[PDB]
Design a protein around this nucleic acid. Structure first.
Ligand SMILES: [K+]
Ligand SMILES: [K+]
Ligand SMILES: [K+]
Ligand SMILES: [K+]
Ligand SMILES: [K+]
Ligand SMILES: [K+]
Ligand SMILES: [K+]
Ligand SMILES: [K+]
Ligand SMILES: [K+]
Ligand SMILES: [K+]
Ligand SMILES: [Mg+2]
Ligand SMILES: [Mg+2]
Ligand SMILES: [Mg+2]
Ligand SMILES: [Mg+2]
Ligand SMILES: [Mg+2]
Ligand SMILES: [Mg+2]
Ligand SMILES: [Mg+2]
Ligand SMILES: [Mg+2]
Ligand SMILES: [Mg+2]
Ligand SMILES: [Mg+2]
Ligand SMILES: [Mg+2]
Ligand SMILES: [Mg+2]
Ligand SMILES: [Mg+2]
Ligand SMILES: [Mg+2]
Ligand SMILES: [Mg+2]
Ligand SMILES: [Mg+2]
Ligand SMILES: [Mg+2]
Ligand SMILES: [Mg+2]
Ligand SMILES: [Mg+2]
Ligand SMILES: [Mg+2]
Ligand SMILES: [Mg+2]
Ligand SMILES: [Mg+2]
Ligand SMILES: [Mg+2]
Ligand SMILES: [Mg+2]
Ligand SMILES: [Mg+2]
Ligand SMILES: [Mg+2]
Ligand SMILES: [Mg+2]
Ligand SMILES: [Mg+2]
Ligand SMILES: [Mg+2]
Ligand SMILES: [Mg+2]
Ligand SMILES: [Mg+2]
Ligand SMILES: [Mg+2]
Ligand SMILES: [Mg+2]
Ligand SMILES: [Mg+2]
Ligand SMILES: [Mg+2]
Ligand SMILES: [Mg+2]
Ligand SMILES: [Mg+2]
Ligand SMILES: [Mg+2]
Ligand SMILES: [Mg+2]
Ligand SMILES: [Mg+2]
Ligand SMILES: [Mg+2]
Ligand SMILES: [Mg+2]
Ligand SMILES: [Mg+2]
Ligand SMILES: [Mg+2]
Ligand SMILES: [Mg+2]
Lengths: 64, 116, 146, 205
RNA sequence: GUAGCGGCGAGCGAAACGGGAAGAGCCCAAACCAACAAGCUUGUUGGGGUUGUAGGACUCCGAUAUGGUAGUCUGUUAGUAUAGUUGAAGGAUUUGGAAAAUUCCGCUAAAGAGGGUGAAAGCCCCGUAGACGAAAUGCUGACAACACCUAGGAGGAUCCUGAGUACGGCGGAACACGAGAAAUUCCGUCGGAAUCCGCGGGGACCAUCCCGCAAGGCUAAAUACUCCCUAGUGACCGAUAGUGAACCAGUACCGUGAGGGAAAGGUGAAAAGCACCCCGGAAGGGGAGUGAAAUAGAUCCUGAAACCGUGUGCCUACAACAAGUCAAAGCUCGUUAAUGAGUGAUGGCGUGCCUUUUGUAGAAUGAACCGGCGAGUUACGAUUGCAUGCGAGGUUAAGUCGAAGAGACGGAGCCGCAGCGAAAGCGAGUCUGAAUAGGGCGAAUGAGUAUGUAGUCGUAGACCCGAAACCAUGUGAUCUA
RNA sequence: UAUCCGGGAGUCAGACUGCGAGUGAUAAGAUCCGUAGUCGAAAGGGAAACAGCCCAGACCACCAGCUAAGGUCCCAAAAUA
RNA sequence: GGUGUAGUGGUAGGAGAGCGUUCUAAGGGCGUUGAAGGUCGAUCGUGAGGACGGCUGGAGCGCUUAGAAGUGAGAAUGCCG
RNA sequence: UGAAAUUUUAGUACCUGUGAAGAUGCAGGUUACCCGCGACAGGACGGAAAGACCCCAUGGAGCUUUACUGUAGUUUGAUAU
């Protein structure tokens, strides 16, 4: 049997050209009155997956 | 394909048992009691291969001290007089002299007693 | 070669690492699993992205987007290829496939302009980019659309 | 690749030229080696098995209690540490074969034949048209051509009498211009070949 | 492992396109027609007719045709399975009990596959290649007879084209799809259509378009599997292995029973297996004798170790000693002949091995000892490195041919070469943004791919043993209530 | 020897000694931190014996020598200095 | 291949080099003038281990290269004897 | 005539001390000719038994209930027969 792809990751990341992963941000759903606007505008900007985290999830989302 | 190992084990154990000759009883017949004693024997061997030198040095020194007291001098003052007089004679040699040629040892003692 | 003189190249084939076959191998008496623990067990360890009950990275992040079932993904030809073909000729998906440039005409050929073109060409495809149109028509070719 | 054409009677008829594409190259020894190991692993059959803890006739009864006895903890009469006992892993039915790239294969063939040519261990012939399949005739042919070592005999598709004549001899392997193989050629030290067979080789390759 | 499903978790997971293997399509109800009968319809027989570029009945035009068969102990014919026959080539010297080994000269091969034969045989034997062969019963395939199917062109006036059916509601299932926006299929229940200007589907649903025509039935081939039979093969086992069982094994034995479940192979070439004599009650020995060999004589080839002894060189009854090591007197032997072997008075130093532990001599754990057995493997995938081939082109999968092979064919498909974005879409740029701004991700910087190999990961028992337990069959009231 | 990239791990029970603090009874071979060392994973020499103290880091051989801490009347080498 | 300098305690653990066993393909060679195995030897190699002899034994087995693994046991209150 | 439990090997003293903190085995000192027989039972933290007290396991089983979620039955209604 071949690998199973973690679909919860396949719905939550995206491959770049260098193989790295794009990701949405947290603290961006429902509770904004507690957050300044700098946080909100800086969190609507995506970011990239960490080194040690990609080390942990690459086997899951190997090809995707 | 299958592998049995009839001879490897037996040869490997005969080696240890040949190493274990002279050992009381089980320690020359049984591989476990032997091996447990072969390793300890090798430890003791490695350690005695150092303590050997200490022991003979100690022995030689006692002999030299005796032969010097019989001339009216001690090991320490003797050897200090020798180091003064630039006389590089090993203690093994000096003990052999004290045993066999007391006259040569006496000459060395005169040298040292002059150096002092 | 002679069968009684066979040799591989150096570094091509490596000796296996057998495990639990004495201490002086280094991989003996624990198999590189270390002392006791869930990792030191047969079928032990944990799932592949498991942080010990800590909220995993996938779960603490949001899902984004969707997939358009009617998506048109085109096969790309970047204008540095086409310096191959003799000037004045007719480029087609059939030509590109026969050459082996494009093996997967996914939705249609799209032509894009990264490299420098140096020929007249009667190129035709599903879609062109505007810079490619400019470069082709400037060299003296002619754009069409299948 | 100028190779001396002999007769079925041993006399040298002349020469034949051969493709430098095939016979003139430098041989790639790593490629030949790879092909050798692959073809032997393919001729392997891999029919060999063993009964694990599950397929073995018995078990079920825990032979005694977990506790109370002064006996070790045991869970089946047929676990690996019993006088019977299912084998832990052991062999399985297994396919050792593997294909590998066509360019490497064809380079292996070319390399082998070019090594034979460089070592002069080809022997071309015009004939091998035996009226009937007697082996002593073929042996006399080998003697005339001064062969005394192993040999592979390439033949056109149909030279049945010559194939039969060469068949029984121990020094001789026989093959029919399409079933030619790296293992066969490399095993052989010399290669007797008909000009027809060489042409068939140079058209299939 | 995509699209999707999913406490959007764990996990689950398609289909179509494409490529191939195999290839075959046929019947019926109904309209109507003819016959019978009861009681103009309506049950039975036959004819007719099976469909979607709508079809058929019905009204007119000619063929009487033409091909096929997925049938028959109708036969013949050929082959094949179940017995089998034949099937070439060597004799001597040395060793030795024996020649097949050695040496000598030869012979043979459509036969040098294998096995046996006093030891290792191309030429001794069984056989092998090859060539012949079946009275009798089956089987397979053709060929004729029989049998069954097989028509064409206009019209649609009218009639028919599968009813408690499709569908809907409620409740549940299967579809990759967990009611979810839930199409599609099926079960129970209740209700409940039209029929050619008709009906269903195209993932709620409506319209348009396209495709098809259910609610009646059959249908070979490719596919899966082996109790078995024949011919065989193995970088499978070789008596703690391999089937539980090489031996009279599902046996002996255990159990009320269901049920569980062993151990145990080898003389010798050939029994030629020890006539006869002696000790002894016999067994068992000792001679003799067979035999190449009896320390090959039924416990039978070899015959380890633990263990039990016999003798002998050295030491040992004022000594404490993880039992050795180092030094060493004396004594006795003489080697893979080299700074020899054995023993050892006496002296110095020195608290076993493993596991697990901050730390174990440990009064923490394990091991009575010896011998055998006994634990990171494989399949499919992913990734990294090393190696090879080729190179911005690298490569085939299935399947066919072919030694259970290599190899050829097979370009469908896979990766990479262009990315960015949720997506539309644009494109070496793209997205955000009013924005030529800035910033993110990317390019100009460039190298990947197929195979092998090793490390590692995942799915599978996944490293070996070890629970109490859970579930589903069954067996037990000969004990006891 | 640092950094970056990638492969593979193991370790998340620590102990004592000295100095700095807390808790403690400025008691504990106590507990918890910092700091340095040692052990762990380190044999050897001294501390009688004695992981954790003092000296010192075993690649091997030597019937060679110089030193360390610690010691020099005997056990037991060295001064009855 | 040599000279010099510096180093070579080690658990978990990582890396690299190997010895040995069974089998296979090839090459080559040894065995009734006595193979393997068994046993004793005072032998060689840095180690795993490798030879040569003596006795036993009675028929198959080594050596070189490469490959494939049921490849190495001292402990499992391990199993069988 | 003929077992068994047990058993790492054993040429198996005492005091004091040390030390994983309670020593036949380490140290220092003392005592002790070698081998047994019958008796006793202080120790070998003796044997038997992977502590039943205790704690832990995101262990199990049985049991209770105004824990959760369900359900067989009981009952009421609608609908069909
Ligand atoms: K590891
Ligand atoms: K034969
Ligand atoms: K549904
Ligand atoms: K001693
Ligand atoms: K790889
Ligand atoms: K490469
Ligand atoms: K250290
Ligand atoms: K073993
Ligand atoms: K007692
Ligand atoms: K419970
Ligand atoms: Mg929102
Ligand atoms: Mg020790
Ligand atoms: Mg390998
Ligand atoms: Mg290690
Ligand atoms: Mg161990
Ligand atoms: Mg731990
Ligand atoms: Mg462990
Ligand atoms: Mg761990
Ligand atoms: Mg939580
Ligand atoms: Mg079972
Ligand atoms: Mg078995
Ligand atoms: Mg599928
Ligand atoms: Mg014959
Ligand atoms: Mg024979
Ligand atoms: Mg002969
Ligand atoms: Mg529907
Ligand atoms: Mg319904
Ligand atoms: Mg058996
Ligand atoms: Mg046997
Ligand atoms: Mg006395
Ligand atoms: Mg005495
Ligand atoms: Mg002692
Ligand atoms: Mg103990
Ligand atoms: Mg015990
Ligand atoms: Mg339960
Ligand atoms: Mg009854
Ligand atoms: Mg200090
Ligand atoms: Mg403490
Ligand atoms: Mg501190
Ligand atoms: Mg530790
Ligand atoms: Mg120390
Ligand atoms: Mg320690
Ligand atoms: Mg000095
Ligand atoms: Mg002194
Ligand atoms: Mg080191
Ligand atoms: Mg060092
Ligand atoms: Mg063998
Ligand atoms: Mg094994
Ligand atoms: Mg054992
Ligand atoms: Mg205590
Ligand atoms: Mg004490
Ligand atoms: Mg001590
Ligand atoms: Mg008595
Ligand atoms: Mg006890
Ligand atoms: Mg316990």
């Amino acid at each position: 049997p071949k690998q199973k792809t973690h679909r919860g990751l396949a719905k939550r990341v995206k491959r770049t050209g260098g193989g790295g992963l794009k990701r949405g941000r947290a603290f961006t759903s429902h509770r904004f009155h507690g957050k300044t606007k700098k946080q909100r505008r800086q969190l609507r900007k995506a970011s990239m997956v960490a080194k040690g985290d990609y080390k942990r999830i690459r086997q899951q989302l190997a090809r995707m | 394909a299958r592998v049995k190992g009839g001879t490897v084990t037996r040869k490997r154990r005969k080696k240890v048992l040949k190493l274990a000759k002279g050992y009381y009883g089980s320690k020359h017949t049984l591989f476990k009691s032997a091996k447990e004693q072969v390793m300890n024997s090798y430890y003791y061997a490695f350690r005695d291969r150092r303590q050997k030198k200490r022991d003979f040095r100690k022995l030689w020194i006692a002999r030299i001290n005796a032969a010097a007291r019989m001339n009216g001098l001690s090991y320490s003052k003797l050897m200090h007089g020798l180091k003064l007089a630039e006389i590089d004679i090993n203690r093994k040699m000096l003990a052999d002299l004290a045993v066999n040629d007391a006259a040569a040892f006496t000459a060395l003692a005169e040298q040292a007693k002059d150096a002092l | 070669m002679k069968l009684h003189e066979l040799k591989p190249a150096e570094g091509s084939r490596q000796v296996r690492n057998r495990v639990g076959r004495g201490t002086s191998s280094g991989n003996g008496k624990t198999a590189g699993r270390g002392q006791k623990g869930q990792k030191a067990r047969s079928g032990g360890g944990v799932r592949l992205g498991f942080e010990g009950g800590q909220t995993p990275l996938f779960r603490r992040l949001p899902k984004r987007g969707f997939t358009n079932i009617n998506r048109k993904d085109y096969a790309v030809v970047n204008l540095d290829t086409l310096n191959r073909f003799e000037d004045g000729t007719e480029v087609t998906p059939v030509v590109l496939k026969e050459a082996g440039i494009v093996k997967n005409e996914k939705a249609g050929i799209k032509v894009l302009a990264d490299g420098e073109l140096t020929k007249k060409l009667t190129v035709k495809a599903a879609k062109f980019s505007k810079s490619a149109q400019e470069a082709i028509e400037a060299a003296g070719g002619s754009i069409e659309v299948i | 690749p100028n190779v001396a054409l002999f007769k079925q009677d041993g006399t040298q008829n002349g020469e034949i030229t051969l493709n430098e594409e095939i016979f003139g190259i430098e041989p790639n020894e790593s490629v030949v080696y790879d092909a050798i190991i692959m073809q032997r692993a393919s001729l392997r059959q891999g029919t060999h098995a063993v009964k694990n803890r599950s397929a073995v006739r018995g078990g079920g009864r825990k032979p005694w209690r977990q506790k109370g006895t002064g006996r070790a903890r045991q869970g089946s009469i047929r676990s690996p540490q019993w006088r019977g006992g299912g084998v832990v892993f052991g062999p399985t039915p297994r396919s050792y074969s593997y294909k590998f790239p066509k360019k490497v294969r064809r380079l292996a063939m070319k390399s082998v034949l070019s090594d034979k040519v460089a070592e002069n261990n080809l022997v071309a012939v015009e004939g091998l048209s035996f009226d009937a399949p007697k082996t002593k005739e073929f042996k006399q042919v080998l003697a005339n051509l001064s062969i005394d070592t192993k040999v592979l005999v390439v033949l056109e598709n149909g030279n049945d009498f010559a194939a039969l004549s060469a068949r029984n001899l121990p020094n001789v392997s026989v093959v029919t211009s399409d079933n030619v193989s790296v293992l066969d050629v490399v095993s052989a030290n010399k290669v007797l070949a008909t000009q027809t067979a060489l042409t068939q080789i140079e058209e299939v390759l």
